[PDB]
Structure 1
Amino acid sequence: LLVTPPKALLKPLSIPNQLLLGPGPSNLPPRIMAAGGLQMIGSMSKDMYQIMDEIKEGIQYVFQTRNPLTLVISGSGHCALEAALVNVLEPGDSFLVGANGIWGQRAVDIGERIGARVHPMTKDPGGHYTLQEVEEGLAQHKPVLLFLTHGESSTGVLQPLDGFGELCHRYKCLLLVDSVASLGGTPLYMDRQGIDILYSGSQKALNAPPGTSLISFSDKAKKKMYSRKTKPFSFYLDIKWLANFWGCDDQPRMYHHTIPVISLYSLRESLALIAEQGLENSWRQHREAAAYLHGRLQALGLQLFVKDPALRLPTVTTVAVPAGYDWRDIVSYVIDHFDIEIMGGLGPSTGKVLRIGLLGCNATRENVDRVTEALRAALQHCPK
């Protein structure tokens, strides 16, 4: 044989203990770790289907919707976003994009690649979107879909949602909202706020492992997707196939792909946990924790990047990089000396911020103390 057994693979796997307090992913509670260690069942068994049904009721609970076209995407954040755009937007269609952070910029890049006409409302890191600025774009471009980042995890901004669905619907437009970094950590009502496509990721405030995502489509969305001239560029993400398998339509579930069974075990449990807590409890926890953290960081003499407290994402706090420090020094000092993961910026916010993450079980005063103690020592030990 050409290749011989890799010598590094012949030692036993060993992973460190890290406290993950960056934008994502998050640490796992015991129940979700327990689910990840279970044995396999038939990917198309009665028992697997029952689990998928329970997961759907769960996504309906956290999204606050009754859309029967609700299901899990076998992929990360990007994969739910991509599934949204490749099933909704045909080549030529007009797409209006709130590019307030990396997430809008990505939604742009996808849009361009599948041949949409892409209308970028660039706002500098920290900025948000006013209903009028939306209708001024809506008037200028007459799009079929508006993408809005709810929890902008690259800028620590909480986008206001109220009204925008009723605005978009007047102009015949569809509302797509990125709630990957917001779901479970701030108020969100899909049906009530008139959202057409809502997606979220497992690895954020739900505390499940990365590589699944949540998506729900309103009836209006469903129509646009179920009366395309062409087929979507993706077969893996084709909604008509996915919808069928997950049991959304009238036809019996036909084999599309193989779903990530053990991940669905974990995701199920993550949804059972926030079910047991209750949504408004979870929003309380994250709102208070966030409040505490900004207090402590303010004491250290650090500055919160988002100045208006009504626009600060509870789940991901941006902190202006203190003048005269190498951000990478701080970030490295923290993990090295305290085994805590924090991040720098991302996209427009690259170099400008530090990012701190409070997500689900991880959103405790304990962890805020820890990250504040760690940032203390770093600030007085990193060169100036």
Structure 2
Amino acid sequence: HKLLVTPPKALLKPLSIPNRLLLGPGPSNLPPRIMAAGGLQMIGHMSKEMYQIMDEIKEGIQYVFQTRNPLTLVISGSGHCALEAALVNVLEPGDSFLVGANGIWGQRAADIGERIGARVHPMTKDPGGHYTLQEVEEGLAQHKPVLLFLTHGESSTGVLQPLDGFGELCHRYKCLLLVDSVASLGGTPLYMDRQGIDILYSGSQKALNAPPGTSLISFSDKAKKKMYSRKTKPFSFYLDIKWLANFWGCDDQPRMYHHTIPVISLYSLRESLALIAEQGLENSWRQHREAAAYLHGRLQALGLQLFVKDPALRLPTVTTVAVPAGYDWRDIVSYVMDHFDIEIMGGLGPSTGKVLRIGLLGCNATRENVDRVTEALRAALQHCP
């Protein structure tokens, strides 16, 4: 009985957190309702009430995704985790996997792809690039993939990817379409079923304004078949779709314990879905598009140039901006934070050092926040050497 480690003096102080206006690519600031849900008491993780809450979230994801797929649920992990879940259940080792690598995200899909032993074929594009129906038909014809991954909202580049008909294309060639909508969901049009998407995921901490840590996923008929008929077991227990599906009530069988869901994160997630259900999807889309419209105008007035030249390809939720010559982008970002308590970001992955990223997300996608970031940047431009 004698202790190596003594109580950490830091823990003996009270928790203190500064106030910040988060106008980077995410996570975003939480509205009052979501914070309130966050502060609530626990119920039983397998209680009848928890299942009710979970059932509502499912309906919520079906609304925001625009799908009727029964195989739709929450992944108990961040965005990445939902991607990993998708890839680990859909791809058996040796399966051919076509990856739209126009930014960090396709990179991450590829990385995961290699790790789980798929034959990974990366359609690589420079940051700023998007994919045409043809490049995909071409890559599809050449490598005969079981799955294609596409980033809808490329948050690393500010690119909005077209999506239209790609699923139809992919269904000829009998290939599955996997789409990343973590950054795009809620702030730009998206219809899972109508666009024939096989696997769609998104994240909690973007336009939904919930805390980071959960993610959203849905699987088509085709996906469900491939996953339930694989010969091999997926490398992951935590992310195994058969178990997850059962516990989320997507089965005929009674719910069986798998892992303990993040009850409190779910309260918040539910509220975030409640909020956007009340606003309404198309309304939310207009707001992001209009906010984004306003923001670009202000930026160019400052003498800044937008990284993505064709406005139809510009992701409304995350805006990229070329680093103004002569300026140390690091200084600008620090300046905005130091003098304004506002977070903006640099690049990420290929776009590193090449851009600034400003985000308009959910209830934070407002004209008034655009004015704040515009003025903060202006001051930055004025004073930074």
TM-score (norm 2): 0.99
SS in 2 for 1:15: coil
> How far apart in 1 are the matches of 2:70 and 2:319?
34
> How far apart in 1 are the matches of 2:13 and 2:155?
38
1:63-111 Cα distance to aligned partner (Å, 9 max, x none): 0000000000000010000000000000000000000000000000000
> How far apart in 1 are the matches of 2:258 and 2:113?
25
Structure 1 unmatched ranges of 5 or more: none
SS in 2 for 1:31: helix
From 146, 160, 163, the equivalent of 1:161 is 163
> How far apart in 1 are the matches of 2:8 and 2:103?
41
1:2 CA displacement: 0.6
Structure 2 unmatched ranges of 5 or more: none
> How far apart in 1 are the matches of 2:256 and 2:176?
29
Match of 1:363 in 2: 365
> How far apart in 2 are the matches of 1:127 and 1:38?
44
1:184-237 Cα distance to aligned partner (Å, 9 max, x none): 000000000000000000000000000000000001000000001100000000
> How far apart in 1 are the matches of 2:112 and 2:204?
21
SS in 2 for 1:133: helix
1:31 CA displacement: 0.2
> How far apart in 1 are the matches of 2:379 and 2:34?
33
> How far apart in 2 are the matches of 1:29 and 1:310?
30
1:277 CA displacement: 0.1
Match of 1:211 in 2: 213
> How far apart in 1 are the matches of 2:215 and 2:208?
11
SS in 2 for 1:377: helix
> How far apart in 1 are the matches of 2:86 and 2:330?
35
SS in 2 for 1:214: strand
> How far apart in 2 are the matches of 1:291 and 1:140?
39
> How far apart in 1 are the matches of 2:165 and 2:278?
30
1:115-148 Cα distance to aligned partner (Å, 9 max, x none): 0000011100100000000000001100000000
The answer to whether the aligner puts 1:233 opposite 2:235 as a matched pair is: yes
1:313 CA displacement: 0.2
- Structure 1 consecutive aligned stretches of length 4 or more whose deviation exceeds 2 Å: none
> How far apart in 1 are the matches of 2:138 and 2:12?
61
SS in 1 for 2:356: strand
1:325-351 Cα distance to aligned partner (Å, 9 max, x none): 110100000001000000000000000
> How far apart in 2 are the matches of 1:133 and 1:52?
40
> How far apart in 1 are the matches of 2:222 and 2:8?
53
Match of 1:302 in 2: 304
Percent identity for Structure 1 against Structure 2: 99
1:147-182 Cα distance to aligned partner (Å, 9 max, x none): 000000000000001110000000000000000000
> How far apart in 2 are the matches of 1:139 and 1:200?
28
1:261-314 Cα distance to aligned partner (Å, 9 max, x none): 000000000000000000000000000000000000010000000000000000
> How far apart in 1 are the matches of 2:10 and 2:59?
44
> How far apart in 2 are the matches of 1:363 and 1:112?
37
SS in 2 for 1:284: helix
> How far apart in 2 are the matches of 1:336 and 1:171?
53
Match of 2:262 in 1: 260
Match of 2:19 in 1: 17
From 89, 92, 95, the equivalent of 2:94 is 92
1:42 CA displacement: 0.3
> How far apart in 2 are the matches of 1:117 and 1:382?
48
> How far apart in 2 are the matches of 1:30 and 1:336?
25
SS in 2 for 1:17: coil
Alignment coverage as a number of residue pairs: 383
1:380 CA displacement: 1.1
> How far apart in 1 are the matches of 2:122 and 2:350?
14
TM-score (norm 1): 1.00
Alignment of 1:249-328 (within 5 A): 249-328=251-330
